[PDB]
Amino acid sequence: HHMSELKIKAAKAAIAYIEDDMVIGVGTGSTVNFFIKELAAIKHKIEACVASSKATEALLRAEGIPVIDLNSVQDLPIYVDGADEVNERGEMIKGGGGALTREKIVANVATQFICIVDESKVVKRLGEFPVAVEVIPMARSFVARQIVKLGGDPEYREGFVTDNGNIILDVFNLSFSTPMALEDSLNVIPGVVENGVFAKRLADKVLVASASGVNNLK
Amino acid sequence: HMSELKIKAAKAAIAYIEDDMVIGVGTGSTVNFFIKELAAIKHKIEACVASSKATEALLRAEGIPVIDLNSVQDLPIYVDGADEVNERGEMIKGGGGALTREKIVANVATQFICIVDESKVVKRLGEFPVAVEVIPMARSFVARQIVKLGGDPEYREGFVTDNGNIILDVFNLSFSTPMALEDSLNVIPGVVENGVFAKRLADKVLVASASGVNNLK
Ligand SMILES: O=C(CO)[C@H](O)[C@H](O)COP(=O)(O)O
Ligand SMILES: O=C[C@H](O)[C@H](O)[C@H](O)COP(=O)(O)O
Ligand code: NA
Ligand code: NA
């Protein structure tokens, strides 16, 4: 079973939750990109999409799917996105692809967050995959010092700039004993724009694809 | 003459500049008078860190060397203004829209010298609005969340920060617990930073008035 095939199964399983005339928030990454291909097939049935990254926006426009600005939306019934790690509670680590900031923003406007993953993203405990932290560029060294004080090990993602013009520190070895408190503790640091811990905005449903099929972990 | 007062406060901060220091420099009209004072002692300065692109342009135009904050580990002094300040050293900042890099530089600096004319001194913070810097696509969302905190956000139309973001100027927030307020703004997704300076206080508050400059703190 190709990894591609599991991602396709999970993508198609999210399609079943799309109702006519919805505005659809779309996440980022390779699993989401198979979902974009599924959305193209039913794009006459929906109104528009909100894009969590410029890459996602380009892919949606290439399919002829209308894209609209989040500020022109107050009611977003569904957000579909992948994750780097997800557990049965629906807590996630996101940001491997560097889009965690707009991802968290769209996810917070959306009523229902559908997380689509193959089985390798499911973990019993969060924390092995690093936490991407988006940082104002001139604050890089200061923020890294503050993260070390929190017991994290930050690694600058060389050469990468986010959609928002910032850099990423990928942080290893943080404690996830209290993940909501951890998510806040990063964000209150001057120069931190956002971080990849999704503990305050959980996935409402977690669709996990394996060889047997797609399982609603949540 | 508010300008005369601002000049007095600026000169009073110059007395804290020692030889071979790297000097962090704030933003705004009071700081711009201090930039003119700094020019007169260029020979004494190693370099300055700039809290805004505008401040960098003013420093470079005086021939004052500018270095990037990521290259600095020892930043002994930061000199900045404020929109409001109390004797505790809590401040509202961001009237000029530079509050994000200001707070970053302030937090690297050892000593924060706040320079103000008398009109900036308040017993209770809160009359001047709190500038909140927001990821542009998150604007309406952040506004809705700020309304839930009891604030009235007003989009600063046409303005873009040094970081490519927009400002909501927020009125009527409760300052009963200023540090918790500062945090509650910064945890909202899409908020980059806000103008409440309650976790990083001014270490010295130099207040210019008719009678001279008084160290409120
Ligand atoms: O925080 C600031 C800009 O972001 C300024 O320091 C503040 O607005 C005070 O400026 P001025 O001295 O012109 O009153
Ligand atoms: O910013 C990146 C997002 O968190 C992605 O949704 C996440 O990295 C999952 O990506 P993929 O489906 O390619 O594994
Ligand atoms: Na922050
Ligand atoms: Na935030």
Three-state helix/strand/coil letters over A144-192 = HHHHHHCCCEEEECCCCCCCCCCEEEEEECCCCCCHHHHHHHHHCCCCE
CB B86 within 8 A of CB B125: yes
A1-124+197-218 adopts what CATH topology? Rossmann fold (3.40.50)
CB of B97 within 6 A of ligand 1: the answer is yes
Ligand 2 pocket test, pick from A54, A84, A201 with the greatest ligand atom count within 8 Å of Cβ, gives: A84
Tokens of A77: 């019934």
Task: Give the residue on A whose Cα is nearest the Cα of B75.
Answer: A142
Give every CB contact of residue B38 below 8 A, 6+ residues apart in sequence. Answer: B14, B17, B23, B25, B45, B48, B59, B62, B64
∠ CA B185-A179-A143, rounded to 5°: 60
Query: A125-196 falls under which CATH superfamily?
Result: ACT domain (3.30.70.260)
- Other Cβ atoms within 10 Å of A66 Cβ, number: 12
Core vs surface per residue A86-123: b (16+ CB within 10 A) or e = bbeebbbbbbbbbbbbbbbbbbbbbeebbbbbbeebbb
- Other Cβ atoms within 10 Å of A202 Cβ, number: 18
Residue B81 and residue B89: Cα distance in Å, rounded?
12
Residue A111 and residue A92: Cα distance in Å, rounded?
17
Question: Count of residues for chain A?
Answer: 218
Nearest neighbour of A108 by CB, restricted to B141, B193, B200: B141
Note the resolution in Å, 1 decimal: 2.0
CB A194 within 8 A of CB A104: yes
CB of A102 within 6 A of ligand 2: the answer is no
Residue B113 and residue A180: Cα distance in Å, rounded?
35
Question: Which entry of A103, A134, A183, A194 is annotated as an active-site residue?
Answer: A103
How far away, in angstroms, is B94 Cα from ligand 1 center?
A: 6
Cα distances (angstroms) measured from residue A12 to each of A26, A38, A45, A80, B74: 14, 7, 16, 11, 55
Ligand nearest to the CA of residue B99, numbered in listed order: 1
Residue A102 and residue A116: Cα distance in Å, rounded?
18
Nearest neighbour of B135 by CB, restricted to A69, A164, A188: A164
User: How close, in Å, is residue B127 to chain A by CA atoms?
Assistant: 24
Region of B8 (left: φ > 0; alpha: ψ -120 to 50; beta: rest) is alpha
3-state secondary structure of B92: strand
Transcribe B151-181 into DSSP letters: -EEEE-TT---TTS-EEEEEES---SSHHHH
Residue with tokens 């951890």: A182
Do the domains at B1-123+196-217 and B124-195 have one common CATH topology? no
* Residue type, position A62, single letter: A
- Structural domain spans, chain B: 1-123+196-217, 124-195
Give every CB contact of residue A75 below 8 A, 6+ residues apart in sequence. Answer: A23, A111
- Other Cβ atoms within 10 Å of B10 Cβ, number: 24
CB B198 within 8 A of CB B107: no
Q: Kindly determine whether residue A102 and residue B135, on different chains, have CB atoms separated by under 8 Å.
A: yes
Task: Give the residue on B whose Cα is nearest the Cα of A75.
Answer: B141
Cα torsion A186, A189, A195, A201: sign: positive
Tokens of A26: 């779309």
CB A18 within 8 A of CB A24: yes
Give every CB contact of residue B63 below 8 A, 6+ residues apart in sequence. Answer: B39, B42
Residue B81 and residue B151: Cα distance in Å, rounded?
24
B124-195: which CATH number, 2.40.10.120, 2.30.29.30, 2.60.40.1840, 3.30.70.260? 3.30.70.260
Tokens of A108: 């917070």
Give the position, in ligand 2's atom list, of the atom nearest the Cα of A95: 1
Question: Count of residues for chain B?
Answer: 217
User: How close, in Å, is residue B187 to chain A by CA atoms?
Assistant: 6
Transcribe A59-97 into DSSP letters: HHHHTT--B--GGG-S-EEEEEE--SEE-TT--EE--TT
Element (H, E) at B59: helix B53-61
Give every CB contact of residue B165 below 8 A, 6+ residues apart in sequence. Answer: B100, B133, B134, B135, B136, B192
Nearest neighbour of B189 by CB, restricted to A105, A140, A191: A105
Ligand 2 pocket test, pick from A3, A31, A56, A102 with the greatest ligand atom count within 8 Å of Cβ, gives: A31
Residue B137 and residue B62: Cα distance in Å, rounded?
37
Active site residue B4: no
For strand A131-135 and strand A167-172, is the pairing parallel, antiparallel, or unpaired? antiparallel
Residue having the nearest C-alpha atom to atom 6 of ligand 2: A82
How far away, in angstroms, is B182 Cα from ligand 2 center?
A: 31
Cα torsion A79, A60, A104, A6: sign: positive
Q: How was this structure determined?
A: X-ray
CB of A154 within 6 A of ligand 2: the answer is no
CB A78 within 8 A of CB A110: yes
CB of A31 within 6 A of ligand 2: the answer is yes
Transcribe A1-34 into DSSP letters: --HHHHHHHHHHHHHTTPPTT-EEEE--SHHHHH
Tokens of A23: 């505005």
Residue B182 and residue A132: Cα distance in Å, rounded?
23
Give every CB contact of residue A58 below 8 A, 6+ residues apart in sequence. Answer: none
Give every CB contact of residue B154 below 8 A, 6+ residues apart in sequence. Answer: B129, B168, B169, B170, B171
Burial class (CB in 10 A: 0-12, 13-18, 19+), B22: buried
Q: Tally the C-alpha atoms within 13 A of residue B62's C-alpha that lie toward its C-beta.
A: 23
User: How close, in Å, is residue A193 to chain B by CA atoms?
Assistant: 5
How far away, in angstroms, is B9 Cα from ligand 4 center?
A: 34
E strand intervals along B51-117? 77-80, 84-85, 91-92, 111-117
User: From the candidates B91, B101, B135, which should be mutated to test the interface with A, based on the most A CB atoms within 10 A?
Assistant: B135
Is 3.40.50.1360 the CATH number for B1-123+196-217? yes
How far away, in angstroms, is A185 Cα from ligand 3 center?
A: 9
Residue B75 and residue B23: Cα distance in Å, rounded?
7
| Count of A-B CB contacts under 8 Å | 74
